[PDB]
């Protein structure tokens, strides 16, 4: 809904910006899982919960 | 095989020292007992911390993430508990007099 729609940037500016910050945190966390598919290693990520 | 075997006997060295470690107590004027010998203990705790930090850079640390990190929580809490303990003991010694 954010990336696909271009009108949301003009009409909902500030919380759209909040989304990428969440997206970057989520994407970085996913990349951490991506290199380590092991369940325990993902479970052993510092402060993952 | 010999790279990771050192991870056990060292870790159980921390295991065996603390379960066998004893707090030295001396009766204080027939009122209570007091702890002495702080220099060796502080050296003992810090050298285990230094030893574990070397395990942190060891490539075989991955198979022992949970237990080695667990000792850091206990070792650091030992340091925090006894850093205030030695001061609190010292203050009470010359305040009761």
UniProtKB/Swiss-Prot annotation, chain A:
Compartment(s) of residence: Cytoplasm, Cytoskeleton
Domain notes: Dynein heavy chains probably consist of an N-terminal stem (which binds cargo and interacts with other dynein components), and the head or motor domain. The motor contains six tandemly-linked AAA domains in the head, which form a ring. A stalk-like structure (formed by two of the coiled coil domains) protrudes between AAA 4 and AAA 5 and terminates in a microtubule-binding site. A seventh domain may also contribute to this ring; it is not clear whether the N-terminus or the C-terminus forms this extra domain.
Disease as annotated in the protein's UniProt record: Charcot-Marie-Tooth disease, axonal, type 2O: An axonal form of Charcot-Marie-Tooth disease, a disorder of the peripheral nervous system, characterized by progressive weakness and atrophy, initially of the peroneal muscles and later of the distal muscles of the arms. Charcot-Marie-Tooth disease is classified in two main groups on the basis of electrophysiologic properties and histopathology: primary peripheral demyelinating neuropathies (designated CMT1 when they are dominantly inherited) and primary peripheral axonal neuropathies (CMT2). Cortical dysplasia, complex, with other brain malformations 13: An autosomal dominant disorder characterized by global developmental delay with impaired intellectual development. Some patients show signs of peripheral neuropathy, such as abnormal gait and hyporeflexia. CDCBM13 is associated with variable neuronal migration defects resulting in cortical malformations.
Subunit note: Homodimer. The cytoplasmic dynein 1 complex consists of two catalytic heavy chains (HCs) and a number of non-catalytic subunits presented by intermediate chains (ICs), light intermediate chains (LICs) and light chains (LCs); the composition seems to vary in respect to the IC, LIC and LC composition. The heavy chain homodimer serves as a scaffold for the probable homodimeric assembly of the respective non-catalytic subunits. The ICs and LICs bind directly to the HC dimer and dynein LCs assemble on the IC dimer. Interacts with DYNC1LI1; DYNC1LI1 and DYNC1LI2 bind mutually exclusive to DYNC1H1.
Similarity comment: Belongs to the dynein heavy chain family.
Chain's role: Cytoplasmic dynein 1 acts as a motor for the intracellular retrograde motility of vesicles and organelles along microtubules. Dynein has ATPase activity; the force-producing power stroke is thought to occur on release of ADP. Plays a role in mitotic spindle assembly and metaphase plate congression.
Protein name according to UniProt: Cytoplasmic dynein 1 heavy chain 1
Residues of the whole record sequence present: 1550 to 1598 of 4646
